[PDB]
Design a protein. Structure first.
Length: 279
């Protein structure tokens, strides 16, 4: 299929050259898959989700997205106009407060929650988790993500916006999950994106149009924004039977656009997420 005038990131995913504006994808659109967005929540009433989004867990006085960041990332996973996997099911887990902050004890608790909760849900195509969050190095936080991955969930986590090596941030430094760097519409590494050998893949991360709270939209930047591109894609392909939860990250890196980004330091992969859908 084709989405004319789509956000530059959606077009990037579907293309082998930057600067295009149509996002080509298989009409299956993540149907039968599920993606957990572990963040500040999701505004599930937003028409862009079409009734496919729902909250399933909060750790605060309200399960409402009082910030928009969780709603933004979910829009990149599966909203109709801004999402990669437009027919996927979205489940919100609010581990971050409305200022975007959250304790590690809560995020850990949130990841353990998803590993058990996928057992109440119908996801015959499989399960993905998008974690646009992180902090300084924590072994318990890294182990939390690896458990979620081992439990049968495709975990994609953001590399960090510190313009440094992601080895000193978590869950970014956990080797078994998928650690996403950010790029811009000119195929440069985003000026903020962390780098390093722990990185597995790059996704669109600078000036990303998506949903926002209040029935609205806006453009923001961060590796928080690239993570849901990779999360949607995994779910897309899993529905297509091309890959499974345990192997999606390797598949995406194996089938990415190689050597195409500028300002990738030595030791960091040069791989841009790509759906290789030949229409």
């Amino acid at each position: 299929a084709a989405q004319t005038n789509a956000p530059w990131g959606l077009a990037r995913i579907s293309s082998t050259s930057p600067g295009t504006s149509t996002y080509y994808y298989d009409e299956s659109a993540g149907q039968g898959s599920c993606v957990y967005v572990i963040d500040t929540g999701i505004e599930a009433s937003h028409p862009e989700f079409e009734g496919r989004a729902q909250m399933v867990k909060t750790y605060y006085y309200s399960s409402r997205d009082g910030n928009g960041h969780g709603t933004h990332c979910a829009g990149t996973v599966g909203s109709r106009t801004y999402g990669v996997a437009k027919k996927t099911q979205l489940f919100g887990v609010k581990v971050l407060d409305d200022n975007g902050s959250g304790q590690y004890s809560t995020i850990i608790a949130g990841m353990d929650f998803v590993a058990s909760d996928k057992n109440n849900r119908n996801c015959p195509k499989g399960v993905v988790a998008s974690l646009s969050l992180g902090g300084g190095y924590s072994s318990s936080v890294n182990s939390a993500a690896a458990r979620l991955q081992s439990s049968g969930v495709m975990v994609a986590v953001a590399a960090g916006n510190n313009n440094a090596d992601a080895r000193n941030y978590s869950p970014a430094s956990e080797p078994s999950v998928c650690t996403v760097g950010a790029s811009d519409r000119y195929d440069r590494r985003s000026s903020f994106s962390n780098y390093g050998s722990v990185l597995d893949i790059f996704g669109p991360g600078t000036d990303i149009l998506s949903t926002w709270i209040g029935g609205s939209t806006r453009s923001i930047s961060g590796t928080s924004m690239a993570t849901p591109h990779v999360a949607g894609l995994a779910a897309y392909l899993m529905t297509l039977g091309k890959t499974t939860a345990a192997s999606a990250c390797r598949y995406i890196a194996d089938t990415a656009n190689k050597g195409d980004l500028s300002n990738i330091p030595f030791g960091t992969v040069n791989l841009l997420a790509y759906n290789n859908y030949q229409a």
